[PDB]
Amino acid sequence: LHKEPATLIKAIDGDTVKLMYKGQPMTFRLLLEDTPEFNEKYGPEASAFTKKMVENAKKIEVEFDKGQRTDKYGRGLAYIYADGKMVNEALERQGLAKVAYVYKGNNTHEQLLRKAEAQAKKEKLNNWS
Numbered sequence: 001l002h003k004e005p006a007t008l009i010k011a012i013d014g015d016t017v018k019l020m021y022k023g024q025p026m027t028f029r030l031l032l033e034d035t036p037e038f039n040e041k042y043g044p045e046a047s048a049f050t051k052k053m054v055e056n057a058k059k060i061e062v063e064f065d066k067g068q069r070t071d072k073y074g075r076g077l078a079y080i081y082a083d084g085k086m087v088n089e090a091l092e093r094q095g096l097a098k099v100a101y102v103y104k105g106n107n108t109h110e111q112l113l114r115k116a117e118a119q120a121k122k123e124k125l126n127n128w129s
């Protein structure tokens with residue numbers, strides 16, 4: 001896979017962020033993730049985590065997988081990086097997301113993200129507490 005540039009427009013919630021990509025505003029949905037909704041337990045914490053990570057980044061990148069690039073709602077489907085650190089993985093490692101929505105052909109980083117999840121769950125962090 002390949003990283004491509006984007007710039008932050010606005011934080012949305014744990015697993016969605018508004019970015020400018022190829023000069024156009026898009027909502028991106030994190031591949032292979034499910035954060036709690038804001039109104040659910042750990043939702044505000046997941047939102048705050050993603051918000052801080054993308055707002056503090058000097059360089060945002062998106063990385064599409066091999067399959068679908070946009071979902072049925074018109075959201076981009078990507079792994080998002082903030083100064084080289086994957087947001088999806090960072091959420092997993094802090095117990096603020098679950099690996100989910102694993103569709104065949106669009107699942108390159110599945111096992112990386114599951115490994116982060118296992119280590120969060122061993123530590124009983126956040127969702128796993």
Ligand SMILES: Cc1cn([C@H]2C[C@H](OP(=O)(O)O)[C@@H](COP(=O)(O)O)O2)c(=O)[nH]c1=O
Pocket residue numbers: 029030031032033034071072077101103
């Ligand atoms: C992450 C992801 C979600 N989706 C769809 C499945 C879900 O459909 P439904 O809306 O019908 O449940 C929805 C979940 O997103 P949210 O977790 O943002 O609600 O987005 C994809 O189609 N592809 C994906 O890779």
Ligand SMILES: [Ca+2]
Pocket residue numbers: 015034035036037
């Ligand atoms: Ca969600």
